[PDB]
Write a protein that binds this ligand. Structure first.
Ligand SMILES: CCCCCCCCCCCCCCCCCC(=O)OC[C@H](COP(=O)([O-])OCC(O)COP(=O)([O-])OC[C@@H](COC(=O)CCCCCCCCCCCCCCCCC)OC(=O)CCCCCCCCCCCCCCCCC)OC(=O)CCCCCCCCCCCCCCCCC
Ligand SMILES: CCCCCCCCCCCCCCCCCC(=O)OC[C@H](COP(=O)(O)OCCN)OC(=O)CCCCCCCCCCCCCCCCC
Ligand SMILES: CCCCCCCCCCCCCCCCCC(=O)OC[C@H](COP(=O)(O)OCCN)OC(=O)CCCCCCCCCCCCCCCCC
Ligand SMILES: CCCCCCCCCCCC(=O)OC[C@H](COP(=O)(O)OCC[N+](C)(C)C)OC(=O)CCCCCCCCCCC
Ligand SMILES: CCCCCCCCCCCC(=O)OC[C@H](COP(=O)(O)OCC[N+](C)(C)C)OC(=O)CCCCCCCCCCC
Lengths: 61, 81, 49, 185, 168, 68, 89, 469, 128
């Protein structure tokens, strides 16, 4: 078969806001945990706190 | 007699003193290769020390015997005390 | 009545599954009296998987 | 012009000391292997100097050509962490290092002479002063070299050690397969 | 080509209580001087090893139940048993040559064979493709080699004159 | 087994002294083995050249200090 | 005699006082064998003798097999552990 | 026969599955039995101690070496039986004791090196055989590559044996530099008393001896014996010792050495004292082997030592095999399997064995009191002959040290018996699985030999007086 | 001073000629991305080594013994006449014993690369 990539998630539309709440919080956790990787992979000229600030901004939007 | 000789000194020169002597000597013998971090460097040092110590001891006994005796007594002290 | 004694009357540990734990790694007892296995089926269940 | 090539044994001794120090000292073990290769080159030189160039070429094709290659092969494939030579880690060795250097060198030079008094046993080892006379004979009619004679004795007078080295090489094949390979069933 | 020795050898040395025939007998002689007892030993080993593994399977079986071993193992067993038996037979005949066991028949046979060889103007113990120096090296490699039968096999194939007997 | 063989396939530098010493050992028993002392001294002298070196040290020293 | 004793002794000391590598241990063993072979061959030349050169070529073969086996054992150790560290052999 | 076996087994194992290795081991065990039965008449060559030089002058064959070879075949027979026959036909005992594919070949090659060590007459043969032993026994320590401890021991053993082999080669090449020879036959009275030669010779002796754990270089081999599998330990703790000590006994190299005396005293004291606080079984038995190696070091200072050495090495081999077999048999009753490789580690796991198997404890008692040297058992006669020789040759302080070590070692020998004859709750009442017939018979035969071999001492001495004098 | 010696020294102590010519003649004004290494590509601080198949290291480990075999045959071919019909048999036994190990190597398939993601060969059976 055609298998999924590393960090793939099957598309599953929640039928509840309370489950999507947990899903969104997990995704926020994953972004925050991966920000150091985003600074190492992309030769970033600024802080890891700045990356997390940007993540929080885009999640507040 | 019954308590200071027959259950005192004659047990010290006997089952009690030998037991304590051998506890200490055993503990000193096994707590010689001290570091399990690296087993190779330690035993390598032991080869080196053995060869050097033997060579110098054979030098000393060729010079004169009775001088090597306290050296061996002190080596036993270091190994077993 | 049982507490394990040794050859010279000294205290010996009764070796269980008790102290094949991550607690009792990173201690510096001699090779004789260590009791951490490193080949136990408790520790080596996920090994080259 | 004559004595420009006199001290070419002493130079090899000096360079060998240097390359051993660099082996012990190099940061990356790849560099230690390269300095081991340089030490093999120096030894091969010295062997040419004393008249054994056959062994020099055998060394070049065996040691450098296979063993050093395998060393590089493994360090290219395996993670071998290293602690750098440090003063907070290795300076404690200096007393024992110096004691052992003196004792081991002096005993290694004393062990080769049969004289009874101990100090004279070193003094004969340093008695390299007088030259050897090389006279010529006419009795050797054939073209026998060192390799020919090695073959002659190894295949006639010493056939057993060759047919035991065969089993040593069998081990060299059968052991690594037993240790590295995993047999299915 | 000359078949004359380069080094001195013992004359009629005593390895046992019985007289000497050859101190380094050829493979051909050791096999031709065999007795029916030796062939019986060969067959005995040849039959004993496979029967041995079946006996072992009977005593303690590999799996739970008894099953006669494969014909694979019986074949390899027969071959190895024949080898062991040939070793023992060669050793028995060689010890008869050395004077360690009773060797009257072999003594008379060697006497008659050497007398016929002298009658036919042939060299005793044969003519070799090798130089005398290599005959010497071969004898020194093969002499008394049956003592190491437990470790390695070695046999004489060289037709040298260093058998420990008088010159004629 | 390879004893007494040269780099060229023949007799070595100190063969003759060794062969003399071994002749004298074959003549002798463990109680008469001390007769073979000069032969063994000769063999070792051929090997290592100690006595000749001491001799040349004496010659050189006479060339050394009795002149300068 | 000198070059070989020197290489041998320095290799032995660099084996004994190695707090760095395992590769240095392998290297020091090989250089020790080298030093022995050089003393051996110098004596072979001075005596005009073949037994020394025979022993030397035998050492070459045996050291090659030693290297092969040692670097198979290291590979098993690495199969299980995945990293060969400064310490712990 | 060994080389025939090796060249046969390599092919037959290459063309066979992993399901066939046990049967292969059985086959070669029967092969070795047939050899030891049919070819053992060669003892008649050595009547009146006739000695033979073979392969030029590279090998030596006498009654001593023939006996050591028969002994090594007997040992290999027992060790192969432990791999070729299942103790119990359970899944546990098919998980713990399985032969690996190449193990038998490596065993036979190591046996070859052992015998070419004892039969060696020239140092080139000795070195080739030492390396053929040591490489093979590295790989034997490493063949169970799914064990962290065994891989670690493999590498430690490689490096330490390598260094000691460097020492042996330096000794050999220095001997050659002095005398221009590789043969010890080149030595006589005159050469010994004319040349100072003891540094070279004792360097050789120590390079050979530290390879079997002679103090102060014992901890590494004791760790190797601890950390290896039990059925590998039983081999690697015995056969190298036999080989090297037999070479050093046949070669009269250390006849009145002060260094060997000192180090032998040290081995006795260490091997007796250090085993007192050991809680593990294999380390205890390793220190036992160390002190027995000391007892056998003592007879490297004698110049007439054949009977004592042969008696003691035979009885020590039988006792060693018996005690390891008893520890292997005790795994059915221990209540806690520690590892796949060392199922039993600690001595207190033998607590209460007399209530599950009493005659196994009788065997243990016999072996323990032979180790202590209690008559009428075999170790007593061993110690007696050693004492006879060393007191006939003037070692009076070493004798008192020997007595004191015999006494101090009894404590850790008796630790096993004491805990074995203790009481235990949750005893065994029934079990439908039965242990093997063959291994039971082998153990019983060893125990009966230990117990009733003194009956034949007169006969053995009368045979020795014809074949060794 | 022989032509052999002259050549074998001259080649090394002259080989850097075009090296120096290139270092002195050619531009050198690096960028960051001219000091870079690829079109795309990256790797975090994951490890320093990749997992490799056993054959990759076994070919090198087995090169040593077979190379030593073929190099040990050199004394024979330089002694072939002097060891006439004795050393011939000896080296044949040598080669046979060393062919046994080669047979072992072939029958074990030690230099073969094995594949994990096998193709499925099992039938499709439907429980009715
Ligand atoms: C089976 C052999 C059956 C047989 O009888 O053949 C006899 C046959 C001679 O026949 P012939 O014409 O009547 O000549 C009679 C004399 O032998 C002729 O005497 P010759 O002087 O003319 O001999 C010349 C030469 C003639 O030989 C040849 O050149 C023939 C070449 C045969 C190649 C192999 C096939 O013979 C040799 O020099 C052979 C040297 C033998 C070396 C020692 C081999 C014994 C060891 C075998 C076991 C392996 C060793 C393991 C040990 C490991 C160590 C740890 O000789 C051989 O077969 C030699 C076989 C050796 C194989 C082993
Ligand atoms: C060339 C000449 C050579 C001749 C030999 C010379 C001998 C030199 C000996 C020196 C070598 C070092 C060995 C010293 C013993 C090791 C242990 C020790 O240090 O002794 C103290 C021990 C202490 O007991 P305790 O006071 O309760 O504990 C606190 C100790 N900090 O002590 C005790 O436990 C109490 C002792 C009571 C007396 C017991 C006497 C028994 C006598 C029979 C001894 C037999 C055992 C021999 C053991 C050998 C050990 C090497
Ligand atoms: C293997 C790893 C690789 C590294 C190898 C290193 C090189 C190897 C060095 C030599 C070989 C190692 C030898 C091992 C040590 C044991 C040697 C030995 O035991 O032989 C001693 C022997 C006498 O003993 P024995 O025969 O038993 O008793 C009868 C006495 N008539 O024979 C003797 O009598 C010996 C002769 C005495 C002279 C000894 C020389 C020592 C000189 C050192 C002086 C240093 C200067 C002063 C201190 C400097 C410190 C600043
Ligand atoms: C005087 C003889 C003597 O006194 O020897 C008696 C002692 C007895 O020692 P233990 O206390 O009973 O051993 C303790 C064992 N437990 C704890 C299992 C009970 O033997 C020894 O320790 C060693 C003898 C050294 C000889 C000197
Ligand atoms: C030999 C297999 C050893 C395997 C272990 C089994 C022990 C066999 C002992 C027989 C020795 C022999 O009878 O011989 C006596 C040997 C020398 O005689 P030999 O040259 O070897 O001739 C023997 C010819 N055989 C092989 C045909 C028999 O003297 C010794 O110092 C032996 C000391 C060993 C003492 C251990 C005694 C054990 C009790 C024996 C109860 C039956």
């Amino acid at each position: 078969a055609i298998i999924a990539t590393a960090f793939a998630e099957t598309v599953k539309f929640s039928g509840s806001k309370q489950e999507l709440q947990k899903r969104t919080l997990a995704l926020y956790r994953q972004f925050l945990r991966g920000a150091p990787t985003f600074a190492d992979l992309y030769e970033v000229q600024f802080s890891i706190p700045t990356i997390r600030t940007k993540i929080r901004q885009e999640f507040e939007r | 007699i019954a308590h200071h000789v027959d259950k005192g000194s004659l047990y010290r020169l006997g089952p009690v003193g030998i037991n304590r002597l051998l506890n200490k000597a055993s503990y000193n013998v096994i707590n010689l290769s001290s570091n399990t971090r690296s087993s190779l460097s330690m035993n390598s040092m032991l080869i080196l020390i053995t060869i050097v110590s033997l060579l110098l001891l054979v030098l000393v006994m060729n010079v004169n015997f009775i001088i090597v005796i306290p050296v061996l007594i002190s080596i036993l002290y270091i190994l077993f005390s | 009545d049982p507490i394990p004694s040794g050859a010279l009357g000294q205290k010996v540990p009764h070796v269980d599954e008790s102290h094949q734990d991550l607690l009792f790694r990173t201690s510096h007892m001699v090779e004789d009296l260590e009791t951490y296995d490193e080949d136990s089926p408790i520790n080596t269940s996920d090994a080259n998987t | 012009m004559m004595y420009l090539t006199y001290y070419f044994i002493e130079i090899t001794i000096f360079l060998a000391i240097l390359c051993t120090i660099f082996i012990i000292s190099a940061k990356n073990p790849m560099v230690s292997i390269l300095y081991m290769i340089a030490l093999f080159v120096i030894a091969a030189m010295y062997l040419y100097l004393i008249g054994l160039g056959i062994f020099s070429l055998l060394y070049i094709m065996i040691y450098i050509g296979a063993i050093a290659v395998l060393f590089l092969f493994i360090i290219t494939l395996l993670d071998i962490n290293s602690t750098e030579l440090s003063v907070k880690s290795n300076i404690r060795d200096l007393p024992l290092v110096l004691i052992s250097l003196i004792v081991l060198t002096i005993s290694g030079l004393m062990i080769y002479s049969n004289d009874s008094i101990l100090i004279n046993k070193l003094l004969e080892a340093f008695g390299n002063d007088y030259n050897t006379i090389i006279t010529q004979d006419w009795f050797n009619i054939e073209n026998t070299t060192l390799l020919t004679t090695i073959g002659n004795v190894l295949l006639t007078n010493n056939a057993f050690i060759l047919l035991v080295l065969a089993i040593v090489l069998l081990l060299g094949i059968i052991g690594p397969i037993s240790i590295t390979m995993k047999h299915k069933e | 080509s000359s078949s004359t020795p380069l080094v001195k050898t013992s004359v009629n040395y005593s390895y046992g209580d019985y007289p000497l025939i050859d101190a380094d007998p050829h493979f051909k002689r050791v096999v031709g001087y065999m007795r029916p007892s030796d062939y019986g030993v060969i067959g005995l080993a040849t039959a004993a090893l496979p029967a041995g593994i079946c006996f072992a399977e009977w005593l303690d079986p590999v799996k739970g139940k008894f099953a006669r071993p494969s014909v694979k193992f019986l074949r390899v067993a027969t071959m190895l048993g024949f080898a062991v038996g040939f070793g023992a037979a060669y050793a028995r005949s060689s010890l008869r040559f050395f004077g360690v066991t009773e060797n009257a028949r072999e003594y008379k046979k060697d006497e008659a064979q050497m007398a016929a060889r002298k009658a036919a103007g042939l060299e005793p113990y044969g003519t070799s493709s090798l130089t005398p120096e290599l005959q010497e090296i071969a004898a020194k490699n093969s002499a008394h080699s049956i003592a190491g039968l437990f470790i390695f096999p070695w046999f004489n194939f060289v037709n040298h004159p260093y058998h420990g007997r008088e010159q004629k | 087994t390879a004893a007494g063989i040269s780099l060229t396939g023949g007799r070595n530098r100190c063969f003759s002294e060794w062969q003399s010493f071994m002749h004298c050992t074959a003549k002798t028993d463990a109680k008469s083995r001390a007769q073979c002392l000069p032969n063994f001294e000769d063999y070792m002298e051929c090997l290592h050249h100690t006595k000749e070196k001491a001799r040349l040290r004496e010659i050189e020293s006479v060339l050394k200090q009795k002149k300068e | 005699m000198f070059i070989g004793t020197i290489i041998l002794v320095l290799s032995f000391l660099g084996f004994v006082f190695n707090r760095r590598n395992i590769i240095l241990a392998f290297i020091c063993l090989e250089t020790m064998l080298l030093g022995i072979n050089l003393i051996l061959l110098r004596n072979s030349v001075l005596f005009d003798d073949i037994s020394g050169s025979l022993f030397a070529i035998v050492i070459i073969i045996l050291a090659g097999v030693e290297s092969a086996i040692g670097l198979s054992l290291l590979v098993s150790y690495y199969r299980l552990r995945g990293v060969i560290n400064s310490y712990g052999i | 026969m060994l080389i025939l076996a090796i060249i046969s087994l390599i092919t037959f194992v290459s063309m066979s599955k992993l399901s066939d290795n046990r049967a292969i081991i059985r086959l070669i065990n029967i092969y070795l039995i047939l050899v030891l039965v049919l070819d053992s008449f060669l003892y008649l060559l050595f009547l009146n101690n006739q000695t033979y030089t073979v392969m030029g002058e590279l090998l030596i064959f006498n009654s001593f070496t023939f006996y050591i070879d028969m002994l090594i075949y007997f040992i290999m027979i027992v060790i192969s039986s432990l791999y070729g026959y299942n103790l119990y036909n359970n899944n546990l005992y098919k998980t713990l004791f399985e032969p690996k594919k190449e193990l038998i070949i490596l065993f036979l090659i190591n046996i070859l090196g052992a015998l070419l060590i004892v039969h060696s007459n020239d140092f080139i043969t000795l070195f080739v055989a030492i390396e053929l032993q040591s490489y093979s026994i590295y790989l034997i320590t490493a063949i169970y590559n799914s064990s962290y401890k065994a891989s670690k021991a493999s590498m430690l053993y490689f490096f330490m044996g390598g260094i000691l082999s460097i020492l042996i080669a330096y000794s050999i090449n220095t001997y050659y530099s002095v005398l221009n020879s590789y043969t010890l036959h080149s030595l006589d009275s005159l050469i010994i008393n004319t040349l100072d030669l003891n540094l070279i010779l004792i360097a050789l002796s120590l390079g050979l001896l530290f390879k079997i754990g002679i103090a102060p270089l014992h901890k590494w081999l004791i760790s190797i014996y601890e950390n290896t599998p039990i059925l590998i330990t039983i081999y690697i703790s015995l056969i190298p010792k036999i080989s090297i000590l037999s070479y050093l006994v046949l070669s009269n190299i250390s006849i009145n050495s002060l260094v060997i005396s000192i180090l032998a005293i040290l081995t006795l004291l260490v091997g007796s004292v250090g085993g007192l606080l050991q809680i593990k079984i294999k380390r205890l038995l390793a220190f036992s082997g160390l002190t027995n190696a000391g007892y056998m070091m003592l007879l490297l200072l004698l110049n007439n030592n054949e009977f004592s050495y042969l008696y003691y090495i035979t009885q020590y081999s039988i006792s060693h095999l018996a005690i390891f077999m008893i520890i292997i048999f005790s795994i059915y009753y221990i209540n806690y399997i520690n590892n796949q490789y060392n199922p039993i580690i600690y001595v207190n796991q033998l607590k209460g064995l007399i209530h599950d198997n009493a005659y196994l404890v009788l065997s243990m008692a016999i072996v323990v009191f032979s180790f202590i040297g209690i008559p009428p058992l075999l170790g007593f006669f061993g110690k007696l002959n050693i004492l006879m020789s060393i007191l006939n040759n003037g070692y009076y302080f070493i004798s008192i040290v020997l007595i004191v070590a015999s006494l101090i070692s009894a404590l850790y020998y008796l630790y096993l018996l004491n805990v074995s004859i203790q009481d235990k709750n949750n005893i065994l009442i029934n079990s439908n699985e039965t242990v093997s017939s063959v291994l039971s018979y082998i153990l019983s035969s060893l125990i009966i030999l230990i117990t009733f071999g003194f009956i034949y001492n007169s006969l053995i001495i009368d045979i020795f007086n014809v074949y060794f004098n | 001073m022989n032509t052999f010696i002259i050549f074998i020294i001259l080649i090394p102590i002259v080989g850097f000629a075009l090296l120096a010519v290139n270092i002195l003649l050619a531009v050198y004004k690096p960028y960051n991305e001219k000091l870079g290494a690829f079109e795309c590509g990256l790797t975090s601080f994951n490890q320093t080594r990749l997992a490799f198949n056993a054959a990759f290291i076994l070919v090198a480990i087995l090169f040593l013994p077979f190379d030593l075999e073929i190099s040990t045959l050199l004394p024979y071919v330089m002694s072939i006449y002097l060891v006439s019909n004795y050393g011939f048999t000896i080296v044949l036994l040598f080669l046979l014993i060393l062919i046994i190990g080669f047979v072992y190597e072939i029958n074990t398939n030690a230099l073969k690369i094995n594949k994990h993601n096998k193709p499925n060969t099992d039938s499709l059976i439907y429980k009715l």
